[PDB]
Design a protein around this ligand. Structure first.
Ligand code: A1ACZ
Length: 385
């Protein structure tokens, strides 16, 4: 029953996703708000602790006590230059407890501090409860994914987050490996298969090259930009609309925190529409000083606004190919991961770089990692019996 059941969890920097393999098919489980992905956010309020959508929905009102980006801290020392550099950009406090970072917040009127694994465990507990609500029984066996570049300390702290959350961690697998499993790229029989995973998420960009030799996975190269993602594209739309508001009304809105955040969420929504329509409309009632902001933008203008950013995704692709010592024609499969890979210009740039090649994109790119993890979790629990 429950002992023969296992889930696959994609524990992402900005969003997390949970899947289950049953009756010959993967089911990506929707949360209680009907969303197939859940924000990796934890909010501490005057009455409760919020996780996911509810935590992300109140981030503007409570920024000092809304934790996100815990994956950037997990398994790292406080003195690490990655931690010291990131801390300057977070509205929550990060403290040092014996060279280990802790996030310090106000919770039910009291000062509390949490290890990154305790924060990630709260996200994992939510994914576990989402699966239990869908299945009708508690599931405890899980496969949890991590970036291919995570070291042993980051992998161990992710497994610890799993244990704190009440999960039996069957295996910690690499995100590009879970994505290649999702597409059945390890079941093509004999001979070495070279796979390139292009992973463009909300806040990070990762390029991974894998070799699959008789079901055995080998990471040949990892490249990317840890500070490039979908949120940089939302911000480019924000700056455009701030300048358009200034041209139409001779008013600078940039300082009004509420106006900028309402514009940001509307920009993110319009950006998603631009992946399937050639235009998107913004409808913001009373944006600033009682002025409605009802406008539109073409996909052509959006592509111009992010042009340099989209083109920058090809430098880590080239860097990964040289590190792996492979030419373009030596890559057998191209896999898309991350919600931002739905952007048509991004797909066109990657397809043209690979000389007109077909892309593996039939599985929702923001779900492909949880999908593969769910497949692996089913194989692993069956072998355990
Ligand atoms: N349809 C879409 N067109 C463009 N960007 C998208 C789309 N869906 C998501 Cl999710 N994202 C973005 O992907 C990230 C999460 O993986 C977020 O930045 C989200 O906006």
């Amino acid at each position: 029953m429950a002992k023969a059941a296992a889930i696959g969890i994609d524990l992402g920097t900005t969003y997390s996703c949970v899947g289950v393999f049953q009756h010959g098919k993967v089911e990506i489980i929707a949360n209680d708000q009907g969303n197939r992905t859940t924000p990796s956010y934890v909010a501490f309020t005057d009455t409760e602790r919020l996780i996911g959508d509810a935590a992300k929905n109140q981030v503007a009102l409570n920024p000092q006590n809304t934790v996100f980006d815990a994956k950037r801290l997990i398994g790292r020392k406080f003195g690490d230059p990655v931690v010291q550099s990131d801390m300057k950009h977070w509205p929550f406090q990060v403290i040092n407890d014996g060279d280990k970072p802790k996030v310090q917040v106000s919770y039910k009127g009291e000062t509390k501090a949490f290890y990154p694994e305790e924060i990630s465990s709260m996200v994992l507990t939510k994914m576990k409860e989402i699966a239990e609500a869908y299945l009708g029984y508690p599931v405890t066996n899980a496969v949890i994914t991590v970036p291919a570049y995570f070291n042993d300390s980051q992998r161990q702290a992710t497994k610890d987050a799993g244990v704190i959350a009440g999960l039996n961690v069957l295996r910690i697998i690499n995100e590009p490996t879970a994505a290649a499993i999702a597409y059945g790229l390890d079941r093509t029989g004999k001979g070495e298969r070279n796979v390139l995973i292009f992973d463009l998420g909300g806040g990070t960009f990762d390029v991974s090259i894998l070799t699959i030799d008789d079901g055995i996975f080998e990471v040949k190269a990892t490249a990317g930009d840890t500070h490039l993602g979908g949120e940089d594209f939302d911000n480019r739309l924000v700056n455009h609309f701030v300048e358009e508001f200034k041209r139409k009304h001779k008013k600078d809105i940039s300082q009004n925190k509420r106006a900028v955040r309402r514009l940001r969420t509307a920009c993110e929504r319009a950006k998603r529409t631009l992946s399937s329509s050639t235009q998107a409309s913004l409808e913001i009632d009373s944006l600033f000083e009682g002025i409605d902001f009802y406008t539109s933008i073409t996909r052509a203008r959006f592509e111009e606004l992010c042009s340099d950013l989209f083109r920058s995704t090809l430098e880590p692709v080239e860097k990964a190919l040289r590190d792996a010592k492979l030419d373009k024609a030596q890559i057998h499969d191209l896999v898309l991961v991350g919600g931002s890979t739905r952007i048509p210009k991004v797909q066109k740039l990657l397809q043209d770089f690979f000389n007109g090649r077909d892309l593996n994109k039939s599985i929702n790119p923001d779900e492909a990692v949880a999908y593969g993890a769910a497949v692996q979790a089913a194989i692993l629990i069956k072998s355990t019996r």
